[PDB]
Amino acid sequence: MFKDGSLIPYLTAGDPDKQSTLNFLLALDEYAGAIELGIPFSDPIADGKTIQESHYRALKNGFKLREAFWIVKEFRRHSSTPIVLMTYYNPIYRAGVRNFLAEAKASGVDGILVVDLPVFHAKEFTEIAREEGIKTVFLAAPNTPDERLKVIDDMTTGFVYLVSLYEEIPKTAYDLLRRAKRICRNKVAVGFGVSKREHVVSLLKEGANGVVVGSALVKIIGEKGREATEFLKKKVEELLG
Amino acid sequence: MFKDGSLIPYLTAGDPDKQSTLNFLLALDEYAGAIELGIPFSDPIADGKTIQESHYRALKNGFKLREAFWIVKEFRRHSSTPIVLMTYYNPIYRAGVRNFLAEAKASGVDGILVVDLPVFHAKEFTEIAREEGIKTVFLAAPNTPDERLKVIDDMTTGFVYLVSLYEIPKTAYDLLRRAKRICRNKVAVGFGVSKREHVVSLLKEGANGVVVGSALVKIIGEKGREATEFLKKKVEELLGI
Amino acid sequence: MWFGEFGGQYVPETLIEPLKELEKAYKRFKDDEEFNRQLNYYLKTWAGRPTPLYYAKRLTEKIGGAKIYLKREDLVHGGAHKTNNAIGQALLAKFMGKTRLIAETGAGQHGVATAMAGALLGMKVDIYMGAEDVERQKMNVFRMKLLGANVIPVNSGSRTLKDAINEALRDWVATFEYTHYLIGSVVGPHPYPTIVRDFQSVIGREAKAQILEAEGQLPDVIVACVGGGSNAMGIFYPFVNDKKVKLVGVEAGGKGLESGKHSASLNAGQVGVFHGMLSYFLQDEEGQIKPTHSIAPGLDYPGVGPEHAYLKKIQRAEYVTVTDEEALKAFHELSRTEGIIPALESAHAVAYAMKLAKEMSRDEIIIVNLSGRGDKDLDIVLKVS
Amino acid sequence: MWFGEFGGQYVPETLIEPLKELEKAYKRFKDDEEFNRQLNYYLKTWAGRPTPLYYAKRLTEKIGGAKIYLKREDLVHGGAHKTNNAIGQALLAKFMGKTRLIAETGAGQHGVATAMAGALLGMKVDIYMGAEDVERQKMNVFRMKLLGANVIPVNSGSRTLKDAINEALRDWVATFEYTHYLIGSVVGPHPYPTIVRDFQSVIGREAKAQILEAEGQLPDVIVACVGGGSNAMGIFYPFVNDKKVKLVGVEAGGKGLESGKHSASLNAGQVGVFHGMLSYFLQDEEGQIKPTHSIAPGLDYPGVGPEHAYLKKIQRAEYVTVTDEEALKAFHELSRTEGIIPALESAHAVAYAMKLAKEMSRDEIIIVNLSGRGDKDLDIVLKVS
Ligand SMILES: *Cc1c(COP(=O)(O)O)cnc(C)c1O
Numbered sequence A: 001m002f003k004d005g006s007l008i009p010y011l012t013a014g015d016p017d018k019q020s021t022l023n024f025l026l027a028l029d030e031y032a033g034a035i036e037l038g039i040p041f042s043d044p045i046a047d048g049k050t051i052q053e054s055h056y057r058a059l060k061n062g063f064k065l066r067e068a069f070w071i072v073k074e075f076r077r078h079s080s081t082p083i084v085l086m087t088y089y090n091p092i093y094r095a096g097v098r099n100f101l102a103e104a105k106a107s108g109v110d111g112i113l114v115v116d117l118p119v120f121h122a123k124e125f126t127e128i129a130r131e132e133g134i135k136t137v138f139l140a141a142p143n144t145p146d147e148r149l150k151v152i153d154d155m156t157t158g159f160v161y162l163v164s165l166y167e168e169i170p171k172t173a174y175d176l177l178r179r180a181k182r183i184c185r186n187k188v189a190v191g192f193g194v195s196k197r198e199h200v201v202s203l204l205k206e207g208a209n210g211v212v213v214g215s216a217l218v219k220i221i222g223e224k225g226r227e228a229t230e231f232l233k234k235k236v237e238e239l240l241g
Numbered sequence B: 001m002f003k004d005g006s007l008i009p010y011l012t013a014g015d016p017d018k019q020s021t022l023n024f025l026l027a028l029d030e031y032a033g034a035i036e037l038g039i040p041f042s043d044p045i046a047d048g049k050t051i052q053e054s055h056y057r058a059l060k061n062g063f064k065l066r067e068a069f070w071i072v073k074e075f076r077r078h079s080s081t082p083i084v085l086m087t088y089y090n091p092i093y094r095a096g097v098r099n100f101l102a103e104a105k106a107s108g109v110d111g112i113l114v115v116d117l118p119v120f121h122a123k124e125f126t127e128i129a130r131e132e133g134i135k136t137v138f139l140a141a142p143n144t145p146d147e148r149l150k151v152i153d154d155m156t157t158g159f160v161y162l163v164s165l166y167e168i169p170k171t172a173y174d175l176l177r178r179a180k181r182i183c184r185n186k187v188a189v190g191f192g193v194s195k196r197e198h199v200v201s202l203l204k205e206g207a208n209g210v211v212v213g214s215a216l217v218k219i220i221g222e223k224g225r226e227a228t229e230f231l232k233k234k235v236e237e238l239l240g241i
Numbered sequence C, D: 001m002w003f004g005e006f007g008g009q010y011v012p013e014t015l016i017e018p019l020k021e022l023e024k025a026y027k028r029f030k031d032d033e034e035f036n037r038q039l040n041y042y043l044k045t046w047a048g049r050p051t052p053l054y055y056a057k058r059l060t061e062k063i064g065g066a067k068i069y070l071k072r073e074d075l076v077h078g079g080a081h082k083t084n085n086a087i088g089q090a091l092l093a094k095f096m097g098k099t100r101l102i103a104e105t106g107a108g109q110h111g112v113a114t115a116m117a118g119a120l121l122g123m124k125v126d127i128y129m130g131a132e133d134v135e136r137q138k139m140n141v142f143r144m145k146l147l148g149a150n151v152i153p154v155n156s157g158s159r160t161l162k163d164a165i166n167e168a169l170r171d172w173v174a175t176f177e178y179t180h181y182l183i184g185s186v187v188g189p190h191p192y193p194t195i196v197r198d199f200q201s202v203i204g205r206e207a208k209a210q211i212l213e214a215e216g217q218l219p220d221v222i223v224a225c226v227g228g229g230s231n232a233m234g235i236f237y238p239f240v241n242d243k244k245v246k247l248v249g250v251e252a253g254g255k256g257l258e259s260g261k262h263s264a265s266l267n268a269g270q271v272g273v274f275h276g277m278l279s280y281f282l283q284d285e286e287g288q289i290k291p292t293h294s295i296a297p298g299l300d301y302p303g304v305g306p307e308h309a310y311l312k313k314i315q316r317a318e319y320v321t322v323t324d325e326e327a328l329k330a331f332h333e334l335s336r337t338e339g340i341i342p343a344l345e346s347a348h349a350v351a352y353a354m355k356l357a358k359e360m361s362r363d364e365i366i367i368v369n370l371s372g373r374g375d376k377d378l379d380i381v382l383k384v385s
């Protein structure tokens, strides 16, 4: 749901505050082909230390679900860049699948990824998602069998999100990408923990439709807080070359 | 083996040192009709706190069995007052019944009391004691049946030693009453005399002898080497002179 | 993966393969004759099973109510029912051909249990523990090290249990090929909630046979404390189809339900999806996990097993709560009256069973699950009291 | 009252009546059907008997010698065989119509065991303890208080065990009418040495039946640690007439027999008469008691039961020693290898059995008496190691 060769940034909504997130989005917009926005959760599961910490920060500063939608809606006043909402199932469950998907669509959200909702358990979700005009994003890992890979692809209407088991990109991660391109009909975005230009280049070269950059960025947002804007651009710039 | 109405002092040999014991003996000699000398043991059994502590003192200052015999022998150079040795069985067992009794006799000891040697187990002892010229002293308590009391008397060649279960207890007087009414031997009482009235009342009730140990060793514990004078003052109080 | 509407397998795709494989293994060994033969072998000669069913003659008469029996799980090797599950999963892991066991721990109880089983079966044991807890648990850490396991302190985040859990998960995703992740209670994604329950059903089975032998009939009530709910599920299960038998779970009321200082997930939480399961959790106004409290460590959990949520729903089991003060009283009472020092977790069940017994007739029967000994809680108690 | 030339009733006349009466009571109840019925009842439902006989498969193979079995007394309620004797004497005291139990304690183990039994049978429990030890045993004192007993600190003399013993004796002489004096080991004047042994014979009986069931034959050797000698006597006794069976007692070698820092009474003491019995004691050149040492508290005693002196004499049993270092090694080894943390006292038997096993054939059988769990010794160990 994004142009090939696109760089996809990831940010945790409300880190350090709802305003700052909107600022970071606007500042990076020009370099991104799509943006992933994460909704803070109290209990992320094996989400990775850097990102895991951003969740705590966001919630410590009193983040609230509506503030997420606000950021997306406000961002929509300036850009149309695809926005993929990333959240755990609890918030959407607690609010009603259709109700959540509806509010999301209305806020200007294009796609959604429910982190802790198994493929074989998302039948009804993908169904209401379609009816609400929201594209689905499911992820796959190196330990994902070619069997499930197909099923994941068959339910994805946005793009398959490939992630690695754990800054040289693991041999195991490239193998996932290889199989993915060789099996999926959807576009494939990779989140292998890119930190230097060579990664982006090598990954695109290997068939990655998109390359996600989250840790590298949220790490800076954690060190610079409200004053991260400039450093984020500098880093993004480095990655696009 | 002592004149009726006699006051019998008790001291722990070697408390605080072998010399001091000889001194205390000589100083009290004139008021005593007989003297009980105790041989320090590492494990006295229900011997009573005041006396129990004297044992520890004596041993802490490095007391040694021969030093006991030395005190007796040295005392014999001045007095002939009957000396009754009081010890636990281990020392005499460790040395040989006959061997111990022999050395005791030779040191000028008149009688002996083996604190932890049951009457029904002292057959051979009383036998060798006779052959070695040592008088036997056995004790009886309030809980001692009239049956054993007789047996105790039948084996005593020195005098039956009456002791209380713990104002002299009513229970203690009852022991004395029965004792006089049953024993052929003289009876000495160790009921924890501490004031003149006790001595008087006890003699009055038929006590051939009244033992005074705690009252004295308590002073020896508070005055150490300088106890001599205070001991006499206390003995004098008890004799009413 | 379900108990009514509850349960599930809500986890990232990275955890699906390991889980799916665990499901397969459990299926082929769940009833393998050889597997159970060994499981019973260790449970018997090493763990000490069966545990006796004791009649608190003196305590029941002091109350003048119903008769009170205690399932003495405090006597199993280790001092807690947790050992049942440890041996089970460790053996299963061995049959699966794994060579390493990993788990995380807060108080250290699960840590030790895992360490012991690993030692018994000769497996490498790595235990994750927040640096915070490592400092607080001097003696438990030492115990784990004595047993041959190596405790890995985690300093990321709050340096507590939550941070240790994530470290464990990350570890498993990368090493699941030869490493098994030992969950300590009937919680988490499928197939754990049910596997753990199965390895604890022995408690109920033994207790059933035992009470029949002593009273010639089934009990009127069965009371057990509920943290995650594994000891409660273990003794409840075998009696689930015996309609006469009333089941009661006791959650930590802490300092009073009306003070936010508790862990009564079933008696005050809303359904939600956390730790890979759809169950009851003490949630925030915004669907975020709330802080919990309880004098008994093992009861200090914001969630609860899916199977208990299901039993509560269909009203097959009744769940209540007891305060720190009440549990603490039962702690002293059981000690002075029956000469048995219970774990603070267990003291909660003892406490409720005591007041419940008072409202019943002298011919009725109550069986309380004494999940563990209280040696571990002397400091806690010695401090407050 | 004699075991060969050893034993006896060497005490002041003031203790004779209480002793004589205890002899009578023990005679009428020793075999009273009702008495034993209750004794077995508590032993089973409260204490947890029987204890399993565990095969240390991994440890025996690591050594490549004989097979090693462990009598798990570490699993009885309380964590030590001491509980067997506590229940026995307390029950006997109750049948005698007594209402109060008194005892003295150093480490606190006997104190706690007594306190638990008293609580179980509803008796007043007063425990004498040197003020020195009271300070050193924070947690055990608290345990005793939790169990309803009141610990009486003695400050006379060295404020240690010896001073507490005398306080207990004095107490008994005055209150023996309604108070029973609970001795903790096969020592002291008659009838204690033998009464205590009788209450511990269960260990051997169970083990015999158990080893027959597992191996179809009696063991080649039985190894147990010896302090006073009650757990050793308890497991030895039933095998005394089975000539095939070798009996081995392990005393505390402390820092080496050649350093005076030990407690090997049988392996280095002279016969004598102390604490009311004629047995072996670590004596002075002048027949005075010498100071003893051992890393394991329960093994730190200058004397030993008369019955062991007798067995040594007639050469029916062989007694050896193990150093603090060796026992300490076994402590760690058993923990890492079999997942069982033993008490330091027990670790001595484990240690010797280990080296003894190496010199035997793979088809031979050794049974080691694991007298207690090592939870109590974590501090001791954690410190040195
Ligand atoms: C940990 C613990 C518990 C609570 O956990 P459940 O899973 O609810 O059983 C209860 N009792 C003891 C003794 C424990 O150690």
Ligand SMILES: *Cc1c(COP(=O)(O)O)cnc(C)c1O
Pocket (backbone or CB within 6 Å): D080, D081, D082, D109, D184, D185, D186, D225, D226, D227, D228, D229, D230, D231, D232, D298, D299, D343, D345, D346, D371, D372, D373
């Ligand atoms: C006290 C104790 C001992 C030693 O005493 P015995 O009377 O010789 O048995 C041995 N093992 C344990 C575990 C103890 O607690």
